[PDB]
């Protein structure tokens, strides 16, 4: 197997700033995701979490990985006041991986990062 769930947990544990509260949620049959897509999911979470910094107030960073019609990752950051957060080279990385996977990516503003890709049929 891909150990996708364990790898998402490890990515959050390694890269989440200790000043941020985190929540990690999984929904759906993670075991159906193939190796290439699991690698993308891990890299997306690593990149998104490593770019999250401390805000003036206490903040929460939520990571949701869902397998439904597709694979979709939603990283929500309720922190405010940092318009340059998430706008670095990591954004190029996330967009590049979405194109690599034939999927899509959205940055919306707290701030929500959504990365999705189709599952192979
Ligand atoms: Zn933040
Ligand atoms: Zn989905």
Distance 98 CA to ligand 1 centre (A): 22
Distance 53 CA to ligand 1 centre (A): 5
**Position of tokens 């990365």?**
115
Distance 33 CA to ligand 2 centre (A): 12
- Of the listed ligands, the closest to the CA of 104 is 2
The angstrom resolution of this structure is 1.5
Ligand 1 ion: nearby residues, β-carbon < 5 Å: 52, 77, 79, 85
Q: State the CB neighbour count (10 A cutoff) for residue 91.
A: 16
What is the C-alpha separation between 109 and 117, in angstroms, rounded?
Answer: 21
Strand order in the sheet with 70-77: 21-27, 60-67, 70-77, 111-118, 104-108
- Of the listed ligands, the closest to the CA of 114 is 2
Please give the structure tokens belonging to residue 16: 């989440």
Domains contained in the chain, CATH given:
4-118 (3.30.565.10)
18: left (phi over 0), alpha (psi -120 to 50) or beta: alpha
């Amino acid at each position: 197997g891909t150990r996708l769930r364990q790898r998402i947990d490890a990515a959050v544990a390694q890269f989440a700033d200790s000043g941020l509260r985190t929540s990690v949620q999984f929904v759906g049959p993670l075991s159906v995701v193939d190796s290439a897509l699991a690698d993308q999911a891990e890299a997306v979470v690593r990149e998104a979490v490593s770019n999250a910094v401390r805000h003036a107030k206490a903040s929460t960073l939520t990571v949701r990985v869902k397998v439904d019609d597709d694979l979709c990752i939603e990283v929500t950051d309720n922190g405010r006041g940092l318009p340059d957060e998430f706008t670095g080279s990591g954004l190029t990385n996330l967009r590049q991986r979405a194109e690599q996977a034939g999927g899509e990516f959205t940055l919306a503003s707290g701030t929500v990062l959504r990365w999705s890709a189709p599952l192979s049929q």
